[PDB]
Design a protein around this ligand. Structure first.
Ligand SMILES: CC(=O)SCCNC(=O)CCNC(=O)[C@H](O)C(C)(C)COP(=O)(O)OP(=O)(O)OC[C@H]1O[C@@H](n2cnc3c(N)ncnc32)[C@H](O)[C@@H]1OP(=O)(O)O
Ligand SMILES: CC(=O)SCCNC(=O)CCNC(=O)[C@H](O)C(C)(C)COP(=O)(O)OP(=O)(O)OC[C@H]1O[C@@H](n2cnc3c(N)ncnc32)[C@H](O)[C@@H]1OP(=O)(O)O
Lengths: 167, 167
């Protein structure tokens, strides 16, 4: 297999993989992003996300005829105390393509991206019940991050943003 | 007062305000970012953060002779399901300058930044004990975000990133 940065041509594949992840998590209807959205947010002159994809030889394409079987979606964030961070948002490999070393390689690639960018750390969320992924991550140096407890996460949606913006 | 985007010249002020926030939270020693860090991460050819600052007339400078009395540090993030988000990382106004409407104006500015960028929402963390800030935010449309529970936040620090990067 090959792990490479995505191209505008892979947007179709990214949306498909994003939907597989959502379905794996039983929330597929939650995905309202469109292919057009990804192309614009990801390959426009200013990307709001970066993506790595795992491509397999055409001989081993998915039954649907897809060469892309995995991806990692990330962006850089900032911590006023320590600086640059690489934030891994989504990470998924299609069932039939797991346990082959694709995910490990994607993580290796991300780690290089992090060092090249001089990020001091990579952060990410893992569902509490997902022992397999927790083990995967902790076998590769991951540790628990306690910076968020004692804190509440809030959101201000578009309706109120617009109101505030125009008061 | 004036709310404006920061300039490379304000880095000194940003670091000072970042340290006041840390001290307000009793963690000032945690700030290891340098002025040089901010200049590079914030005004280099690619910013890892954006900042708004509140400037007051020289007549009302701080005892230390500073015109900058508040700031907001943010960056854009991405949610594979809904797209672009504006993430507010740090938000602080010096004690003697609060209750004047500076914070409200900063939030108004951020909301416009969010709409201009077509973000569907603005996310941010508030310490659980901080009822004053919770009220401030909820009076302006904020609501609780439940997307993170049932999830654990992990980190992979530089040591392991480098190892993985070079295995
Ligand atoms: C920030 C986040 O978004 S975290 C959410 C991550 N995603 C998920 O949990 C969704 C479901 N899971 C997946 O999509 C995948 O399993 C991933 C992305 C977690 C991992 O990717 P994969 O390609 O399956 O795994 P990879 O093949 O590198 O596997 C490493 C594990 O497989 C085994 N393995 C790796 N290569 C091989 C191989 N060639 N032969 C046999 N076994 C192998 C290893 O023993 C390793 O085990 P460990 O985790 O106990 O150390
Ligand atoms: C993502 C995060 O980082 S959240 C962490 C936010 N930070 C903190 O909690 C640190 C400590 N607090 C602060 O630094 C500040 O208080 C901030 C940033 C939270 C708010 O900024 P400020 O400039 O103080 O507030 P501002 O003056 O706009 O005040 C709005 C409140 O003050 C009152 N107020 C505003 N303008 C005036 C005025 N001209 N005259 C009298 N009262 C006023 C309002 O009643 C309003 O009350 P409400 O919150 O109950 O609605």
């Amino acid at each position: 297999f090959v792990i490479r940065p995505a191209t505008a041509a892979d947007c179709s594949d990214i949306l498909r993989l994003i939907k597989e992840l959502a379905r794996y998590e039983y929330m597929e209807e939650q995905v309202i992003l469109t292919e057009k959205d990804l192309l614009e947010d990801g390959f426009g002159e200013h990307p709001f996300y970066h993506c790595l994809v795992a491509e397999v030889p055409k001989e081993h394409w998915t039954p649907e005829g897809h060469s892309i079987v995995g991806f990692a979606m990330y962006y850089f964030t900032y911590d006023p105390w320590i600086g640059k961070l690489l934030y891994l948002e989504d990470f998924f490999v299609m069932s039939d393509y797991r346990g082959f070393g694709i995910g490990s390689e994607i993580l290796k690639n991300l780690s290089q991206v992090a060092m090249r960018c001089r990020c001091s750390s990579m952060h990410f969320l893992v569902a509490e019940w997902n022992e397999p992924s927790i083990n995967f991550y902790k076998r590769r140096g991951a540790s628990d991050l306690s910076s968020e407890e004692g804190w509440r996460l809030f959101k201000i949606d578009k309706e109120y943003l617009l109101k505030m913006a125009t008061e």
